[model samples]
Target: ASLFAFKSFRENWQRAWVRALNEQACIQIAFEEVLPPRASISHVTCVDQSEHTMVLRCQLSAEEVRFPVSVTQQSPAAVSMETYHVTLTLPPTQLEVNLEEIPGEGLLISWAFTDRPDLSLTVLPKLELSTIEELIKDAIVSTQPAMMVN
Candidate 1:
């Protein structure tokens, strides 16, 4: 069977933002259907910190999923200047997901289902990273065309 590809950066970003709002949102949709819940994330470790960025590392179980996440502040004038960027890597299989900050107080998450040889299609939610990123990008670009002008 040929491998089908679905790419949507906007959707991915929305998914990430929603995930942050509710951590357990992806639990049933992402894993249980395809694979059993191997592990659960109890806490995240803060790795690095600077004026502009803060890095956090999380530990996962064998069946656990991990994402390298960072929170940043772009503008000093903004009252709440925190943003999130998450880079996810699934263990053993090594699937990769990259998430970054969107212009308007949200996150952009993107992922590709790699490493699996089988043509099993993973039916992820609409809020998944790939879909959400496009949403965020559109909102950012439309609201502040000046953002790109600079």
Candidate 2:
């Protein structure tokens, strides 16, 4: 190849890359759900773009979202990104009703089934599913009328 060949190749490759990045790239998102899980990376259209950012609509977990990504690595013509974890949010607390009894010594006149039944339980939990299982379940349990302990 000649200097002219190499010159346009880099320039064109760079422009193509930048165009694809800002115009066509599908910032992928997915989750097989393990330290090393399965499934290929998601592919989506660049619905919108910003300086070093993008906006797209996708579902995570089974259809794991092609979530917002930042450049982890970049080059004259291409870039890389760090895969991020996603979380589901809890709904309004007042909508939930709990049914589990706290351990240790305690007396109950009846039961008020709210995930937040005690001082230890009053606050919200973080990303850990184990911490929010009851909260999550309570959403489903809200259909029933629970006892109210004094």
Candidate 3:
């Protein structure tokens, strides 16, 4: 239920079946080597915004985290400077994301969080790549400032 890319194409499909309101526009993300019991995370980071202009931060461990963000700035744009701030916890410790690594090549990504950081892909075919390649199988896939609007 999302479509805030400037509306009113004769009120296109009831405003393109919309829901949720107030506050939006942002870009900021980073993901480094993550592995262990109950591993979780999936990627689709940006591909084209051409250097700088995305500020995403994260936290979780589990509220089934939902950060469905938006904003492509065009026409009277106003997500109010599109500021994004996230911090949620509950006996689950203060979630953070910043694990540095490279001893042999891996670990070091922190936008941070520790409760519900499920970047919902709705169980992509019950994932199973020989146990997800041991979380990165010693990591090696770098090249991103952030851009996942694909």
Candidate 4:
């Protein structure tokens, strides 16, 4: 007998949908503001020079892009979710990235083209897979915890 056959079908479906959202959420993107055009963080090569310091070889390119800049994500209950809002002019170029990890937050990443030193971008994207994992953990609903002796 299939173990899942005994489980509620509704609960199984919920797990599938929730799992899909979190899988699709992790990603990377470039930004734009003016009339230049759209580009992307084309190809990234990571080089770990030290424990906390890593170098990335990033390539930027003009490509078909949908969203330029907007709220990456939001919390429903008016919780203050820090979103990185920026206006960028991304031209096709190859530049290096300096990625540094903060204590609790994710990586602090930034890069710039040598041609235009004046224009640079620094972004901090929320790394929330663990948060989603916890969400699903609670969603399991049927719980197991310490019980007081009767």
Q: TM-scores, in order shown?
A: 0.24, 0.18, 0.16, 0.31
Q: Which prediction has the highest TM-score against the true structure?
A: 4
Cα lDDT tens digits for candidate 3, 1-150: 122133432143222112101111012221211101231223323322323332233322333322222222335654222322222112232333222443554432333233332231211221132332222211112212111121
For every candidate in turn, the CA RMSD to the true structure comes to 18.4, 26.3, 19.8, 19.1
Model 2 gets an lDDT of 0.30
lDDT of 1 by residue, 37-69 (tens): 353333445545555344443432233322222
Give the poorly placed runs of model 4, Cα more than 4 Å off. 1-40, 63-91, 117-150
Residue pairs whose backbone atoms clash in candidate 4: none
- Cα deviation in Å at residue 73, candidate 3? 55
List model 4 lDDT by residue over 45-95, tens digit each: 775577976676666554322222223343575534333333323356666
Tens-place lDDT per residue, model 2, 16-118, is: 3233333322333222122113222123234455553334322212122222222245668986555433333323232221223334532111112234322
Please tell me which model should have the higher lDDT, number 2 or number 3: 2
User: Which of 1 and 3 is ahead in lDDT?
Assistant: 1
State the lDDT at 132 in candidate 3: 29
- Highest lDDT scorer: 4
lDDT of every predicted structure (CA atoms): 0.31, 0.30, 0.25, 0.39
What is the Å distance of residue 134 in model 4 from its true position? 48
